[PDB]
């Protein structure tokens, strides 16, 4: 089958020379990356079986007499309504090409992996700016929502309610794409925004090629940005956020929280105003008590102080985000900082340097409490990232098949705390969607 | 408390002379109607329950130095977020006044009650036109959804799923306002419209002063029209529709159904193309079996051919509507009719003449199978209208308290079927939302 | 020939009943008025020969299968570009129907001629409001421009330059439609507005059925309002104006100035802030000296104080209008008055009562200086109005043909001043466009 | 004085790093180019006359606490109204920086001067695309207008009349910026567009750094593009055009004409459909007689068939353009070409290679009738380009002051015709605006 799509944006202005350049066999890595990201978006209705299921799917950007076409060959039929692609999906496909070509033409893999801290931040800024994500005529308004991909009905309803109350305050939502808690808040917000007659409500999705197949963008996402890697996505979250709401989740939400806390612990960041709320329904009380205990036992009370826990109160969560926008606006003004990008935030290179989750790199992590606590948070971040990769990313699953489980080790008492945390994730269904068993991609050496 | 609202529409250009006129003793009934309709909109989130709970609520239209203001005095607090009126609620309040003054200035009560069929039809047209509801450059896209105010979770989810799929087909939603099945489809469509990047989605609510407190408008409605009475609301539904979806419901939904089948049985209406779908989840199969059987044994197996029943298939419902629009378009074109208003539909005055729910009038109904089927449908419409009024309308409740239950009588076997249907509505929780006991305002004389 | 035009506005929503009502022989006066106003607009590329030139022109509003059409039969071909009506002309035709039907359905000729002062002002307000002329979210911005229909190249260029400088300040222009000084400022302003990237620049045309054929709306007019008569047009000018610019002109511009000055002389209007500038090119110095002398010799220095004369300085004229907007804004705020309509302005019924320019009524005017000077201005207004009517209006030219010239009399010294003023108008080509002789429709009895 | 301008476009998102880069010694020539191009835009209302008059003018792009600011230091006061920058001027300043940084970052001087034909063509495409000038969903509507900067009142009025009639046909205008015939059509079109209610009318100005001070952009231009050099400006003209109107002019207009005829004579261009109209008022008949004769006696009577001459008929010019668009549309469709960019037009490198106006290069031109006609046209293009540069460009004026007049030589009879044409340009006041004497920067060796 063939869907020959006429792009409405910049793709419609590619020259024959540019198309020939993209189709050159020397450019196949970039062209394949595009194909793979298109598939993730089209199949949103984890990487080791979905890339093997639509093996016959291909793209072909081609100049026809009537103009440039994006041909989709054997696409998921769920992306179409009477053989016409869902309009939001079309927009997301054009977004995908935009980001892949922009990054591919400006930055080498050496730039992206091995540049200094300042350069890696500028890369994040440059990609966001080209995506038209950054609006200098807007006051703080963006709430980043983090949470589990795999959550029950009670938890899911709670995320929708929180999103609804946030939308009623006229605030926008940014998530990392995907099901569960990364979609619910956006759906809820669409209701809040409609009641408030909000035009141009912003639903920001930030992703990267490694995670996009496992956590794919729903077409309610109206601004999609593909960052080059997981570290640049994390940086995009914290540079764009004006507030952060964190629901219960698994290893991915564990990774984001440790990223966030490790950075905010930094002496240079004590000045920051950035409201962070951990929140869930009444049933999540035990979850949050134990997570708060984990944070205290690992990186200390200097980190526990950075957030507030609100249980079973969607209106209060939204009130906190709303009061927070005023404090953030005041912070950026007083600091000579932009509303649209938090330049004053100080992110150490241990939080930016791209981590390749191999068995050697995972074993080399220093998980002991005689470290500066910011360094401990950095390595804990990398450790959760390896677990995410071994669970859902294509290359990560490959590492598990050739070497077996990752070995995570460190100080006895800390590894005992980590072992309990991860067991709780498995037990609560947080590591994998229902329907089959979860086999851990890791072992914690206690 | 006081909320002093600055109107953005025509209320902003009322003169002092005109405000004085509205506040005159001669217009006191009309000004109260406005106060009562405002209250219904503000406390949306039965017409004798909330009126004794907001006795202190008042409105006051006044010219101030900075312009005309709508003062809400002791309004329901749910209508406000941080002390500012929800924007859509302000839009609803403005449409209430628009309709009340329009009707109040052009049509006397005698005109509304006693005019000929064509005049009544032109009254409905006039109000809808004034409300800016009629769009001459749009092809058929309006789906009317009817169903119960008191439905369970399975039924509510199905209404949202259906609304979603209709929204994916780019179509608009019209309901009678209020909770349950009159709310679900709008919520679903919002998401479907979002995926399809639909600009200017229409969520049309049609109501009237008698029913509005019992079925109050949700701010998700972005075009509200208040018709003078229930009969004119019903005419609005069937003249604006391009397709009708009917979910399980109680007495209101039955009133609507018999109104529709009654009119569609007409000789002059055999030409009409109007898709009608009765639909519900898997668990509603028994309900529709019994409903279909009721129709066939009252108004005949001919009337059963006017609709298709679809159980447990939301995409199929939307496909049937989408295909239906093409036939509706062809029908209107073939007949030289308007897309925006079905002028060719023949509505007999027995469906238009406003029915006052009194014991006198209910007992004088001819519920006999030897009545011509169109006339039986019109009298069944009236009987259902009386149950609605007895249950939830202020002046219907008056008759019940002063004279006891309505008595409904007719031919023995027809009364036994009616008794069975109404018993099934009571049993399935359709006559009243959970909390208190339902006390029947009727007794079927078997 | 037939141009069958599909209207884009409310005309597209007329019912067959409404069309039959309009076409009834009892409604032919109203339908003919429409026809006549359509012709004036279509022939903009004085009434005694243009109504006789397109005798075969007719309108036919008709319901076709595809919708309501405005059929134009034998229209001026200048209104069309390849047999497609100029879009601005279409909009003006729809405006024409809107105003004629609104006034025709709400007000009898008895209302319009014989109502009290307050009622006649409300009529003006009601028609403007229905025309959507009044915008309560705008601060003062409207400059009314008055001047000669028949002016030379130097004078015309000057009006364009003034309009350009006004447009550069973001101010809008209101004129009474027609050639010469009533078009130039709008053309100039279109350039100023474009340079300032003004969206929704407002070009307001105010006319009435008597003068519309002689001074017809150019399609650069983007808001056209037809008032019922010349007095209601004059009232519309002064109720809408936030500033007034007056160029050299003939009897029509003489009429407007005397209207304006007579009102502003009133004790109740001394409070008003309303910048009035008389202005022209260097050649107009003698003109303005003599007009200023006429004002002094008739109504006194109490009137000369109400305006400033600026010669040969388009930038200063615009600066004065711009400073004036601030003073007008301050006036309306301090007075609890609207920005969009000057309600506080006090207009005596001598300025409102519709004057029928018959020979008996003209001779009955009291043109002596032992009157209150406001009453003298009122009668001077009526006298200039009779001259305009006898020169260019259809009924006025008829009065001249059956009775000969109007006889204007009064006090010797005053009539000598008037005789010199009118001779100067004739001498300067101000009474009639070039190409034929002007024969005065009046005699001043000296 | 200081005007600190807040940019609304991409300049608002320059980073401190990027501003530091622009201010580096390595980018000094580029930053000056921006200053010089800003000055030209600000003092619009020859490239050595105004540069010595605003020596104190400077620009300064700086990050302030409230955002990025464009400081204009001692700017021309004409660019300001009450101290605020004219909005369209701000838009022009923003487009200048957009183009200067785009070209400056992607193309070295060697690339611009020395690349192959296809690369040069792609450079023009790239800049126009970046400028958002290319619209893939629009059918042909762009009329390029060429003509003299120094024209009398009769000629200027005719250009406005032509612009008016083109605007009435719904078409857009492209010029080379500057006064006279490059200003008139835009002013006329504004009015024509206004009558036709054209939303988003396009007034495209194409310029380059050498010519911009001599022909500075009027703020009526709403899309400005600065191309790297005159040859690329010329390519932009002919690749964007859907029709060309050529008014009387001097050396610049002659350069343009011979460029066009030179390219249209190509074998590969015989397929092209591009309406070309030479037009002027009644008084220009002699000019066009002599011009037509010059063309026939230099490049042949074949080349004369490429254009139609229309004298004294603006409506006929617009009709010929409007009909032309239909043929242009059909041509592009038949050939599988774009509407927005004429990719099929063949442009020989002799028309593309940037020509530096030096005595060496001018004398090395082959102006002989036994040259192939395309090559003669390309060398005549170069000769006219040298007169333009000698008259009005900074570095062209350099060569004249250091080495005296250019000598132009070739075959005796061709030189005698060239001498005659240039003498006629000087005599008719076309080489220089009134005020001072024109001193020829050339001598034709006869």
């Amino acid at each position: 089958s063939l869907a020959s799509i006429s792009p409405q944006g910049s793709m419609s202005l590619l020259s024959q020379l540019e198309i020939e350049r993209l189709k050159a066999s020397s450019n196949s890595q970039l062209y394949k990356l595009f194909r793979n990201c298109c598939l993730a978006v089209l199949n949103a209705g984890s990487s080791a079986d979905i890339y093997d299921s639509y093996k016959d799917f291909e793209v072909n950007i081609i100049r026809r007499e009537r103009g440039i076409k994006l041909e989709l060959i054997e696409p998921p039929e769920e992306a179409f309504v009477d053989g016409e692609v869902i309009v939001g999906i079309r927009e997301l496909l054009e977004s995908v090409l935009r980001d892949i070509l922009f990054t591919g033409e400006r930055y080498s893999e050496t730039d992206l992996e091995h540049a200094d801290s300042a350069t890696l931040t500028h890369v994040v800024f440059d990609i966001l700016r080209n995506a038209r994500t950054l609006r200098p005529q807007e006051e703080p308004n963006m709430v980043v929502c983090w949470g589990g991909h795999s959550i029950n009905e009670i938890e899911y309803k709670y995320t929708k309610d929180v999103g609804y109350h946030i939308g009623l305050r006229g605030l926008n939502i940014c998530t990392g794409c995907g099901p569960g808690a990364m979609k619910g808040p956006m759906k809820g917000a669409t209701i809040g925004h409609a009641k408030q007659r909000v035009e141009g409500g912003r639903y920001l999705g930030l992703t990267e090629p490694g995670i996009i197949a496992a956590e794919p963008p729903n077409p309610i996402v109206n601004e999609l940005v593909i960052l080059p890697d997981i570290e640049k996505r994390l940086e995009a979250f914290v540079r764009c956020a004006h507030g952060i709401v964190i629901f219960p989740g698994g290893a991915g939400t564990a990774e984001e929280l440790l990223y966030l806390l490790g950075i905010l612990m930094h002496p240079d960041n004590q000045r920051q105003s950035l409201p962070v709320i951990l929140t869930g329904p009444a049933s999540s009380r035990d979850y949050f008590e134990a997570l708060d205990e984990f944070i205290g036992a690992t990186i200390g009370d200097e980190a526990r102080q950075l957030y507030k826990i609100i249980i079973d109160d969607p209106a209060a969560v939204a009130q906190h985000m709303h009061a927070g926008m005023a404090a953030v606006k005041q912070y950026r003004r007083d600091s000579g900082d932009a509303y649209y990008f938090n330049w004053t935030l100080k992110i150490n290179e241990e939080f930016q340097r791209p981590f390749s989750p191999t068995h050697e790199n995972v074993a080399a992590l220093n998980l002991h409490p005689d470290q500066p606590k910011e360094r401990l948070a950095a390595d804990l971040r990398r450790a959760f990232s390896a677990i995410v990769a071994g669970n859902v990313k294509d290359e990560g699953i490959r590492q598990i098949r050739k070497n077996g489980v990752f070995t995570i080790h460190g100080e006895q008492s800390l590894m005992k705390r980590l072992d309990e945390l991860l067991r709780a994730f498995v037990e609560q269904g947080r590591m994998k969607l229902p329907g089959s068993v979860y086999n851990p991609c890791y072992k914690v050496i206690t």
Side-chain angles (χ1 to χ4, degrees), chain A residues 86-158:
Chain A
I86 290 162
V87 177
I89 296 180
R90 189 196 34 82
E91 290 188 4
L92 293 184
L93 296 184
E94 295 191 46
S95 298
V96 171
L97 194 55
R98 174 202 67 208
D99 299 334
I100 292 172
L101 286 187
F102 177 82
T103 307
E105 285 163 348
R106 288 183 68 118
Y107 299 107
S108 65
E109 207 218 59
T110 302
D111 293 341
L112 299 171
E113 289 190 358
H114 302 291
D116 60 52
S117 186
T119 307
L120 297 173
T121 299
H122 271 114
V123 170
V124 172
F125 169 77
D126 202 24
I127 291 158
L128 293 169
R129 179 175 62 175
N130 184 253
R132 298 167 44 87
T133 312
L134 310 179
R135 283 103 105 129
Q137 311 240 141
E138 302 201 357
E139 296 177 341
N141 67 96
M142 196 64 66
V143 176
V144 164
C145 298
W146 288 338
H149 83 281
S150 174
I151 56 170
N152 69 13
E153 195 106 333
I154 297 296
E155 285 193 9
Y156 182 69
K157 278 185 281 183
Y158 188 79

Side-chain angles (χ1 to χ4, degrees), chain A residues 183-197:
Chain A
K183 173 180 65 173
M186 288 188 51
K187 291 186 163 200
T190 299
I191 306 303
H193 283 167
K195 292 188 183 195
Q196 296 279 32
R197 305 282 188 271

